[PDB]
């Protein structure tokens, strides 16, 4: 019966890309400004800033 017949099952290539699981959306409003992400950066391995005491 079914033994005589041939099954090909079923398969697919959804290729869903597993991504990061940890919540990392904590920037600007998310942290109420506590942790902020600035697209712009600065030159030099260091960025000093002299302010009055």
């Amino acid at each position: 019966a079914l033994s005589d017949l041939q099954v090909f099952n079923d398969w697919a290539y959804k290729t869903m890309s597993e991504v990061l699981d940890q919540q990392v959306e904590l920037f600007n409003g998310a942290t109420r400004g506590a942790i902020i992400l600035r697209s712009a950066g600065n030159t030099g391995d260091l960025s000093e800033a002299a302010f009055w005491a």
């Binding site: 940890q22 919540q23 712009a40």
Partner: protein
Amino acid sequence: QEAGAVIGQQLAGDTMQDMLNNGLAAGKAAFTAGGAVHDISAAGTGLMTQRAFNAAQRIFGDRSTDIQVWVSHSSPLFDLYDNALANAEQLYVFGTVNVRADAFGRPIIITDSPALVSGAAETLRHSTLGLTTGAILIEQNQDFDSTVVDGTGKQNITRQYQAEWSYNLGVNGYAYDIATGGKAPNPTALATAANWDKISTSIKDTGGVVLVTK
């Protein structure tokens, strides 16, 4: 080329993650070096009736309203949730259990950051850091470089995708110590203490207070 898209979407996720983790680790170290560190590990898992939050709020004496958030890991939250489940102090009810407040109008940020957990089992500790406006500064340098090299000579060509960039990070009221750190610090140097010099004359001027709990 299909691999490029998944590489891109994962990259974006991992880049935002890496930046956040490094920021959290550097902030923790800066507060610890600046003396804005409070340890409740001895007093159980801490967050006891959120008195640990109050005890850490004590650090900002005159203006504790500057800190208006509480970044932490998931485990501390469920420890506090378990505390809310058993109101030994009769301060909670069946409804008032799943709360993200420190009883001082500050939301408790929850994130599985490896920069917020240190050690395993008993040595495992949880750092809940409370932050003011503009406490943690992250500035991407936007110096992203991307070249895929197609390795040949083998039976099958195998591309070698490589991507490199940089981002500037800083802590309000704190300054990185290059002598203890380096020109290009790794996450470790950013997380280790003695790598942050306290500049602000008073602690309340600096933004952020870390609360270490079991």
